[model samples]
Target chain A: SFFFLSFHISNLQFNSSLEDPSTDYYQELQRDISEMFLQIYKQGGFLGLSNIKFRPG
Target chain B: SVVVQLTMAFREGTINVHDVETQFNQYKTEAASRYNLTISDVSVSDVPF
Candidate 1:
């Protein structure tokens, strides 16, 4: 039995100066996003994440 | 302000939806400060399987 969370975040920092890697903009953002998930995991919750995305800069 | 919607899979058993919502409450604020983002309209659903 798996549960899913569906939501959206506005005002994300995608238009950074490091616009290299093309993917660099979003891939970097995803790492920062772990802070969001870490809270849940700490509460003895098992999570499955990885499909994260932000728009083109 | 490109808003990206997403999904997170949770497993570890039949926890109440309200409990998950509580987690998101903390998650939203923390992420808000760190990433300069606002999380909106979160919903949790159990797989019909």
Candidate 2:
């Protein structure tokens, strides 16, 4: 999250997001964030950060 | 170090970036002048840029 919760997903014109559960921004953010976390998690693993997912499929 | 945070107000559920720009300009000016820092580089980004 570059700007924390500051930058609005709506402003980005994203329909869905991973960080945000609701809003149309969830889908894209989910895919992107999922890949990002997956790569990082496979490396060393951060303290509290775990597997980031879009949702239960 | 000075940190400035702004919460944007949405109009009818749409973000007004021009409005946010007006505010951000002030911070950008201050960061440039007051800090005597030159913005040597800037990287525009996204989840994937």
* Total clashing pairs for each candidate: 0, 9
Q: CAPRI band of model 2? A: incorrect
Which residues of candidate 1, in runs, are more than 4 Å off? A13-22, A53-57, B9-11
The CAPRI quality class of candidate 1 comes to medium
Chain A accuracy of model 1 expressed as TM-score: 0.48
- lDDT for model 1 comes to 0.60
Please give the interface root mean square deviation for model 2, in Å: 16.8
- Model 2, A10-48: lDDT tens per residue? 112322243465645554444443343333224322222
Positional deviation of residue A25's Cα in model 1 after best superposition, in angstroms: 0.8
Instruction: Kindly list the per-residue Cα lDDT of model 1 for residues B1-49, writing each as its tens digit.
Output: 4444345555657666677667777677766776676887676765553
For this target, which candidate reaches the highest DockQ against the unseen true structure?
1
Clash-forming residue pairs, model 1: none
